[PDB]
Chains A and B, each alone.
Chain A
Amino acid sequence: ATLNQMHRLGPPKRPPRKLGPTEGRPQLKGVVLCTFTRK
């Protein structure tokens, strides 16, 4: 890209980070509904 195009677009815009199963929290409390086994 040329300098004009870089100026027009501006600094790179990193997408916001994805929140995981814990929603960005160390731990979560939960109530067990059912127990089973998976393969």
Chain B
Amino acid sequence: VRSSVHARWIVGKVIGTKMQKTAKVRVTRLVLDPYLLKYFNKRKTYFAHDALQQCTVGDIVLLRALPVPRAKHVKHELAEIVFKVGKVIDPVTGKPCAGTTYLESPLSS
């Protein structure tokens, strides 16, 4: 009722930043193979409005649907950056991390 865009909330990876104020994002969903009964990743490209140009190629972002499309292919906007590429903050402990190791120890605070 609040939007005409089908995909309301979607998480994706930024794969392009060559458009002005627009981020090209790759979104994967799990689709069942009817014959093999195994789930495979299916990819779809979304253009997300990024007014401040804070998105970098490789970061994981959350996209929220616009009330109406602002362009032919731009139907979403950047709600937040879930994982900045190479600058991940462990949501569980709130500490910076590099892969599977703590850059700052949780005990440090």
Contact = CB atoms under 8 A, between A and B. Distances in A.
Interface stretch (B6-14, B34-42, B83-91): B34-42
Main SS class of interface, B: loop
B40 to A, nearest CB: 6
A24 to B, nearest CB: 30
A25 interface: no
B29 to A, nearest CB: 15
Chain A interface main SS type = helix
A3 interface: yes
A11 B35 contact: yes
Interface string A1-35: 00100110001000000000000000000000000
Contacts of B40: 7
A15 to B, nearest CB: 19
Nearest to A12: B35
Interface of A: 3, 6-7, 11
9 contacts: A3-B36, A3-B38, A6-B35, A6-B36, A7-B33, A7-B36, A7-B38, A7-B40, A11-B35
